[PDB]
Design a protein around this ligand. Sequence first.
Ligand code: QKO
Ligand code: ZN
Length: 257
Amino acid sequence: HWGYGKHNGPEHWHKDFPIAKGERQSPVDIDTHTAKYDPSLKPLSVSYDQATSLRILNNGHAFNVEFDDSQDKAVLKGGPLDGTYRLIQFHFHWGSLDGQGSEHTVDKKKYAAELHLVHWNTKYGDFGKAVQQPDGLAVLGIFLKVGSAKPGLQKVVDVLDSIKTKGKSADFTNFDPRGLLPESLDYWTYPGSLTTPPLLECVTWIVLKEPISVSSEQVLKFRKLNFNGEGEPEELMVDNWRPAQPLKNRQIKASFK
Ligand SMILES: NS(=O)(=O)c1ccc(NC(=S)N[C@H]2CCN(c3cccc([N+](=O)[O-])n3)C2)cc1
Ligand SMILES: [Zn+2]
């Protein structure tokens, strides 16, 4: 019964998921002055032209846009990664107000929201096997700030009224995730974890430096979703973010000088 409420939030997760206090937990604060430029990193390769979106689901914690990952259609390669990672889903974390919502922070700055594009390593054959491995997932993280509308986000915003409550889904075909990227693919990278239970330490994090701009109207529609199921007391889906975790014995590397 984990969540983001007064009594089941991140400070409680360690009781059911002791890895919550582990050596490679996410998210983290990115100290821009201590992150080292690594000239040996490669440009990231984001190959989304053949992406097949299928469905959008309110899972009670966020909403997931789900992809066909039954073959190598939408893949992330290069940068810090060895081999090929298949896009399985994306989701967001956001705040009750614009001054909070991101999971990663940049010099302790909180963004209004953060997009996670989740990919799994095809050398492990399926997602459930990949999450048992230290290099099993690659998550591309993109900050959202409030300003101009993001045109590529509006198809997502406009379906949210149809998946208001936990367990609701809707058909969501032909959505192009390239419309969610910023101009620059400059990034920071570090080894971490899932940011929700079960908090598995299986993620190569790749966090873009350049945020995307969304409008106030767009993020207000995220904040009208519900954590609760249909006919249950209304609990607005806001502040579904985990705060920064200790960095411990880890180095954040920058792709840019
Ligand atoms: N915040 S975060 O980015 O650290 C992060 C947190 C949690 C997850 N959990 C994920 S992607 N869980 C999996 C379990 C299986 N799974 C599938 C599998 C096949 C098809 C679908 N589907 O519904 O289309 N979903 C989703 C990953 C990433
Ligand atoms: Zn996430």
